[PDB]
Ligand SMILES: *[C@H]1CC(=O)C/C(C)=C\C=C\C(=O)O[C@H]([C@H](O)NC(=O)/C=C\C=C\C)C/C(C)=C/[C@@H]2CSC[C@H](C1)O2
Ligand SMILES: Nc1nc2c(ncn2[C@@H]2O[C@H](COP(=O)(O)OP(=O)(O)O)[C@@H](O)[C@H]2O)c(=O)[nH]1
């Protein structure tokens with residue numbers, strides 16, 4: 303009976319932990335995809351600044 | 360004097376209910392526990408099975424789900440049982456020996472022992488216990504053998520007797536029956552003094568081939584069983600000389616402690632006509648009237664008890680019983696002299712002027728263990744269906760050990776068959 307309790311508990315534990323690790327990895331990945339996208343868009347705004355500066359000469 | 364009766368699980372409660380209906384009728388006890396019979400023979404040994412102007416079965420009803428015990432309570436003699444003697448859980452055992460023996464059964468077993476103790480404690484001189492169960496399910500098999508072990512610990516000098524229904528593929532509920540039966544047989548070998556082996560395949564074939572019932576129900580099978588249980592307990596329950604208590608029966612029937620598995624039989628079994636003592640005797644010894652699906656001509660009798668019931672010539676009984684032994688002497692081991700004993704009770708079963716019941720300790724019972732062993736191995740070699748057991752905490756090694764122990768039993772029977 304102790305063995306059966308232990309293995310049920312260990313199953314819960316491992317399922318809990320695996321899920322926590324996937325939801326964190328997923329979150330960091332999604333965030334990074336978004337941050338990269340926004341950084342490209344910001345490079346473009348900086349480039350448009352330079353164009354308008356280049357025009358002023 | 361007193362025997363305490365325990366019935367566990369679906370099969371165990373269903374046959375146990377029928378046993379109590381049948382013996383209550385024989386002892387003149389009505390469904391309200393009142394005595395309305397007309398022979399003092401009925402009451403002389405009533406306290407063996409009944410506490411006392413009412414008579415109440417010394418019976419404990421156990422299960423891990425409520426349904427069969429609800430039917431018992433509603434059934435014919437359902438109000439005769441003491442209400443405190445119904446002990447049941449809710450979760451069930453799922454046809455799983457591990458659930459009965461180790462997990463669910465473990466939660467309920469102490470409450471069963473409380474009731475066992477209360478019944479034992481008002482006994483003037485408890486002789487021991489009789490348990491009805493199947494070996495193929497979860498509760499009767501796993502929890503029933505757990506109970507037997509716990510009773511032995513608390514009453515180690517009392518006799519333990521079982522009526523144990525052995526599974527068959529031909530009359531089967533689940534594929535895991537051979538696992539549950541192998542695990543149980545290992546317990547019975549160590550912890551019972553006497554086990555009546557009742558094969559569901561034998562019951563079916565008797566119903567189908569001999570009784571001409573086209574489609575047998577469990578009800579049909581249990582009718583057979585309850586008739587046989589009545590026959591085999593006759594000498595416990597009525598005045599007499601021979602096998603009159605559980606311990607005397609064991610001393611006469613069990614020459615080696617492990618070889619305590621008996622093949623019972625009943626006669627008559629036919630599809631109004633008078634039966635003769637010759638006919639009873641011949642039918643009682645015929646393989647087709649025996650309830651373990653083993654051919655006694657494939658082995659030898661170590662010991663036999665025969666019980667005749669009804670008005671009949673004691674002289675002709677002794678005569679025919681000597682004819683069978685003298686005519687078939689090779690099937691009786693010669694190194695146990697006078698190994699067949701005969702009792703006679705005047706009271707017949709209901710509906711019959713005359714009957715006979717056979718209890719054989721035959722080396723042919725090896726065939727029943729071998730069959731279960733082969734069905735166990737076919738699955739266990741592929742570890743099939745084991746997850747149901749391992750999920751309750753059991754290890755494979757316990758299955759290996761049960762299989763070995765049952766194969767050992769088979770070898771032990773073979774040795775004495777050859778001796
Ligand atoms: C249970 C009986 C019941 O539900 C239905 C009826 C009406 C009868 C069943 C009879 C039966 O099974 O009988 C066998 C056997 O078939 N009978 C004979 O062979 C009779 C005469 C032979 C002459 C040559 C015997 C049997 C198992 C009877 C038991 C005794 S214990 C109580 C049950 C009642 O019947
Ligand atoms: N003879 C007979 N066999 C039964 C009966 N009910 C179940 N069985 C058999 O018993 C085994 C299943 O065990 P069961 O008693 O139903 O399970 P439990 O309730 O967990 O003990 C199988 O071998 C079935 O064929 C019954 O009323 N009579």
Ligand SMILES: [Ca+2]
Nearest residue numbers: 450462463466
């Ligand atoms: Ca539980």
Ligand SMILES: [Mg+2]
Nearest residue numbers: 369370496532
């Ligand atoms: Mg069942």
